[PDB]
Symmetry: D2
């Protein structure tokens, strides 16, 4: 298990090929746009060494201690252990960090346990898993093709190499060129270029699955407008430390070593990779724990805002808070059933229930916008009446302490709270979180169509046919 | 455990004091408006004797066999057994019977296990429980006051005795007069006049809890407009057999024997009766199983309708069906967590988790109208193109077999299906189901306000305060 | 202009070929299922002769007086006159009659004014218009094909003649066979078999537009389950008089005289018939007035229910009523703009603004379910506590007058009101109204796709391009 | 009529008492946080002198030319002229500037026309109007009290002077102390401290209405966190120029000259000021035109995004765009009816219809969040894949031109468009717009309660009573 210092030193020494506003980022650990999230990930690693959480976040195996997200679960108890680690890490950042590495470790763990799925590339998968685990490396990923002409398939874009495709194969590996649309949290040592979870690969030229060091020559991470509001924790409680960053990933004829190839030119293998291996089940397990943590944070903030300005005495405000409670319980319920109904898949890997997780990941994208709306409706103008810590420290400080106090709440505490509520919903950072929840796991339109097609609807249809037998009997 | 014949004979011999359109109902077992539901309840009782389900629906105890809903659960396994019985009974009627007796048996069971709660009336409660259990009697209940002037409390209505109040107490018992607004499924041997689950009793004169035989002199059940569409199972697949009926309950100076009194003049005891005893937990347990069954029925019908007319090829139709699947999984999740997180209450009674059940009973009233809407959006005009079995048997039968066939579906089967979908949503019977789901457990406005007030929000608020410490540190 | 007596005599003498539950309906004017709506339509005709409304409902022209819905408007004032007639008729039945004849007269009127559109069949159209106008006949229509396999076009169903198609052409006319899915209000002298408003005709064999007497040999109207709750106006205030009935229309090799043919084998003419002639504009004009009347009825009922039980003192109840007010004003606004922005089309016919009417007919289907929901949320259990007038007239009458009185409202008046609210929303009749509002003008999915394609979006796109010029200038 | 140069010189010479992060803003015309919006307002003033729009934006009167928003309308044509000016100004900034001065000029104009309402202060009002008009000054306003303890009235806060209250009265005027919660667009010469539009004044000490120069000693404007993303029009198309800023307004014992007092200590006059004078009608008129402009901008962007990435070929995407079209038409309809149904009030001032405007201002806050959602659902990941103009100008420029091109759309144009869509919805600037639309005119909860109470519901209730006469007749 890595310490924060080791993670920071690793990035400083071999930084990912990041670009920000036309220039290469030489040191993300000190760059104003990235130092915040780097410190945050480092803190997650350090927590693994805190005696209070060591048993929760890591496990011992043959003299070594590994991060819990690498544990191949053999029992429901192990599944619960993975869940508790997901939750503890998520709580550190109020569920605002959506791409912490344990999400992808769940994917790699499942791929490794179900390695036979990959055929001749099975050993590469097992070895890669052990590599990430032993060195406790941080990962980022990109599974989608550039949004250019969505009316056409990957092979029907303006250029055959807009999506990442194989240019040629050599004795050393494969050369790829193209791009992936989005990779969140590029402050990692490795990047996973895996298949889409719900979309079809289309052509063999694009049916790929491989991993590379983020410093690989020819690999570029083009960052979008930064959403770090500032460094003050009072003024920007969240964006100052949890801005993971999103970027376009470019492959300028990048060489991928054969040992890092997991799938090559096999459309079928790409299309069922997550479902067959159980990666889908485990990555969704991390998500349900994460969204439970996020919902708990919103509940706390909503309750405090309402109490803070005396709005909690109004029935409709109480109802809005109760609504968040209902959603919180719904997520806890999915989480519980996912673990309690777990069964082994075709490769003997115990996986959390897909029914419960499909329910959670398809329901939360609908609940989140409403949870966000509730905070807006409760806070109202208090959400934009945001003086700075500098205003409190300035000449008008005394006036602010009078006009911005709340009901039995000091002004500084009140503004600190509303600054947080604002950063969770209305700052550029907060607003992005909404778009993230709506789409990170896929386009809801196609996720729902996928659920329809894969779900076994026969038992329910059969019960109706049986019930209708009495109806048709009138003609006998 | 009762057989259907015993239930039917009991009603015929000592029928409840029912009134329909100005006249007393002499024999509900043969009356056109009630014979359907009577036969349905009888069938539920008979199922208890089917060898295939005997072990699911009943339990043996000291030479006797009792209905599962009377079982005082000692372990989570027992809780699961109660749940499986709720589900099996619910499935028989596609979850359309909302007031089957096992719901109230759950209440009485909990009251009995937590009998110490009732003080001097504890033995009356225990004895009543044993009575209902041993004779396997059917119950109905009414907990709300007449909807007259909702702007005023029970003691502020046009008359002190609009709500049920104590007139006087004698050596034989108490005399009560007033009325209860609604009692569903009056085809029972007993009626439970218990306190409101979420509303305050208000005055001692109304703080009551007692049970009476439905034939008690002075007790009247005034039925509303019947929703039985007819007797043909083809034309009215559900209303012909599952119309439970709703009625106003009148108490014309009714004498309640002391042995049938459970709470008298104690506002506090009335206000916490369901929560303290665990009745709330267990009755909600029956509800979650019931709504899971209901959602399964809608899923089957929606899937069959879409497939039947070839609408399943359209993405948005697939999405609507997937939406029902998400809701189904949500209910299954609440159900699972309710049992898995069960703990004993203050009286040593194991009760399913309130968090999960409060989530289920406060979420489903919001989901149901949408599930109903989905069926309407899928069926469209097919939902009102409802010829009768008589039309198929008539001269135009051949034409109907051509114009009303579906995609690889015969016309009679198609119409049988749409007649069912219509009866589940648009017939008077179907439409009532929507109002029922919206309100049976209470007014959502006050249920949400209640949830807000009773839920422990402190842990979430505390986490936010801890997170904000860094914000306030800028002033140090 | 016809009188009610003339309409009733016409139906009695030459009744439409109606079938109900396997038998031919010999006299709809006395049949229990149809006498109610027949009396209602008759009353609409009689209103044309009431001196108070004669000038509103009819116009004089060359010694004759015709129904206002036949008036070819030359000015905005004439358009307003047509609107006021639509409204007055709609108000008589609280906007519950969705297929009153003035809706179709608007269609025929527009077809006649724009008759050149129909080419060689132009005179047939003009003559038909004059026929309907002079004799003030009642019409019904059916524009959709049987719902069999929606995954296939009209020419791809299990049989080439499931949809209405031309079998052959002779010296006397054309012979057609097939069926139309739905025709509401079959108590008419004529039936209009016109093209779909938003769907493509597909094949020439189905590209038809003609009209026939409802008694034409080979023509059959198969009625669905009747929704008449009874004859008591107290018990069934609406279903006893406004149940229009829906039916499947069968064509058993029906001969259509050449003079009654308006479009034959011309897919293009069918696909643009309503838009080019202005029929769409005028029929939607009747609809907006009708929905304004319907919304006014719901507002009145909601206000009275809330006041009646004292629920109007609660903020959320006030908000729900205000919501209906907002929707009412929205419809009034569309109506006003539709008339004020009216312009002449290609044939010189003044037509109300399509933008405003497309807004109204695409928005109301979304608002109605909510308006219905609001009534349910306000009334709660009062909506199913429906004793009969017979109960009030019976032995328990005195008790009911006490327990069902409202806040300063007598019990009989209270129940009369809730019986009405129930009939508007939860009776089989009421529930059907919801499905009707959702679909009568077409499937929302395709109506919205149609609006997208026909609307001129260029001006808005152009404004954005202009705004972005400054953005692209940074590269100069 | 003012020119932009005159406005800029005025602010530079006598700048409002603005504070940003603890320091006084000496020159808002050059300050990085304010220079953008200052230039934008200046451009609005300059447009008044463009020959193409002079007749639209100004009117001549006795040798002088004034801004159209000052015109006291005598006819519906004048009302239309005011509307066209509101629209032209709104279009310049895609409806993103919510507090342009013409909104408040509408208020002052109405106050002046209905000056008799103010009694002894009537001349002060007339004179103030002429002052603002003649010098074409810019105004800002603040009507709400500090959000401290909403469970208590203005007189029940932690201090009697948290809300703005009169300390004393002298020969020169009144001295006030306290604060107003929010004032948007403080880059004005004058600030209007008027009564709340929907809330009660409460106590005479707070029942005030006056105006002051923004540089008045003791008056302070404390600005919130700035939302200007940068100066690049490519990177921040909107926040670089339309960030109006919100601020808390502090009154440190400010002296208000008697000539600037319009209402003093009269609760009744404060509570009906906007309705009686017609200010409510006219300010809402500006709003409906503004929201129509805003909706047109969103329609253009949504259409371009969908077309740009080829998503317009999908039915659901077309439906979402059509949804915006429906909302656009709804707003146009309210606007049209507001002008067409205009009538003179008690003071002879012609005012647009309140019914239509109450509909528009109570409906749009519900429509806007959905319009915003639609853009998010259409753009998906394209909304966060935002490289900078600097990235296009850098080494990877060529790669970006390939991977970020759209369907028949160049990469720079595509990113310029998505940068705009992002700034309209997800940037801190964009997200604030949502909160603004939800609350600027008041809390929806109380706006709806207000609408319920003031609307005349009697006609609808009367129609229902008349309809029910037939129901009650059964007892005769
Ligand atoms: C009470 C009532 C009264 C009516 N009265 C009249 C009347 O008087 N006269 C007359 O002509 N009609 C009448 N109608 C018919 C009405 O106009 C149709 O119901 C409406 O146009 C929808 O078409 P449909 O029912 O055939 O739906 P279908 O097309 O069968 O649709 C069923 C479902 O499949 C989907 N679907 C089907 N095809 C497609 C597609 N290509 N793309 C995407 N989705 C698709 C639909 O969205 C929907 O979810 C009435 C309907 C009702 C419900
Ligand atoms: C971006 C933005 C710009 C604005 N610009 C201006 C401006 O230029 N000038 C100016 O005057 N104002 C402006 N406003 C102020 C705006 O008018 C208010 O936000 C709105 O009137 C709501 O009042 P409030 O914020 O005080 O909410 P609060 O009253 O504090 O409400 C907070 C919450 O408590 C509830 N609540 C509080 N009291 C009650 C009650 N009695 N009954 C039921 N519920 C209650 C509310 O419903 C809500 O959920 C702006 C607001 C925003 C958000
Ligand atoms: O695979 C996809 O098509 C969308 C997606 C992307 C990243 C991820 O983690 C899950 C789903
Ligand atoms: O034409 C259609 O496809 C549907 C429709 C049917 C009847 C009507 O009056 C309007 C639209
Ligand atoms: O007056 C209020 O209570 C809210 C409000 C504030 C500013 C405004 O322009 C309109 C309404």
């Amino acid at each position: 298990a890595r310490t924060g210092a080791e993670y920071i030193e690793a990035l400083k020494t071999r930084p990912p090929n990041l670009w920000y506003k036309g220039e290469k980022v030489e040191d993300p650990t000190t760059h104003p746009v990235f130092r915040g999230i780097v410190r945050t990930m480092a803190a997650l690693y350090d927590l693994q060494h805190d005696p209070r959480y060591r048993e929760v976040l890591t496990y011992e195996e043959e003299g070594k201690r590994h991060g819990m997200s690498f544990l191949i679960p053999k029992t429901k108890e192990d599944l619960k252990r993975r869940g508790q680690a997901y939750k503890l890490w998520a709580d550190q950042n109020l569920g605002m960090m959506g791409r912490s590495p344990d999400y992808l470790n769940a994917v790699v763990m499942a791929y490794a346990a179900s390695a036979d799925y990959f055929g001749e590339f099975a050993e590469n998968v097992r070895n890669y898993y052990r590599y990430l685990r032993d060195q406790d490396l941080a990962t980022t990923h990109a599974l989608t093709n550039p949004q250019v002409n969505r009316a056409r398939p990957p092979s029907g874009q303006p250029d055959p190499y807009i999506p990442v495709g194989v240019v040629k194969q050599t004795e050393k590996g494969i050369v790829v060129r193209g791009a992936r649309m989005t990779a969140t949290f590029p402050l990692a040592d490795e990047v996973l270029i895996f298949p889409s979870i719900l979309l079809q690969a289309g052509s063999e030229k694009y049916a790929l699955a491989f991993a590379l060091p983020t410093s690989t020559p020819g690999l570029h991470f083009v960052c979008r407008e930064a959403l770090v509001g500032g460094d003050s924790p009072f003024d920007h409680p969240l964006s100052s430390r949890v801005e993971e960053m999103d970027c376009l990933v470019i492959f300028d004829d990048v060489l991928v070593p054969w040992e890092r190839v997991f799938i090559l030119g096999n459309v079928e293998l790409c299309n069922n990779a997550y479902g067959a291996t159980g990666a889908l089940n485990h990555m969704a397990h991390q998500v349900v724990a994460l969204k439970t943590a996020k919902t708990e944070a919103f509940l706390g903030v909503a309750a405090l805002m309402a109490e803070g300005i005396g709005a909690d005495v109004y029935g409709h405000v109480q109802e809005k808070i109760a609504e968040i409670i209902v959603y919180l319980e719904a997520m806890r319920a999915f989480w519980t059933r996912a673990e309690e109904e777990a069964k082994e898949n075709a490769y003997g890997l115990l996986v959390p229930d897909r029914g419960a997780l499909d329910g959670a990941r398809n329901l939360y994208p609908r609940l989140y916008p409403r949870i966000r709306e509730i905070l807006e409706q409760i806070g109202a103008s208090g959400l934009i009446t945001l003086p700075s810590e500098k205003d409190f420290k300035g000449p008008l400080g005394p006036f602010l302490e009078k006009f911005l106090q709340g009901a039995a709440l000091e002004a500084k505490e009140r503004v600190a709270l509303f600054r947080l509520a604002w950063d969770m919903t209305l700052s550029g950072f907060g607003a992005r979180q909404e778009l993230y929840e709506r789409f990170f796991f896929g386009d809801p339109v196609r996720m729902y169509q996928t659920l329809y097609n894969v779900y076994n609807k026969e038992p329910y249809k059969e019960r109706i046919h049986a019930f209708l037998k009495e109806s048709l009997k009138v003609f006998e």
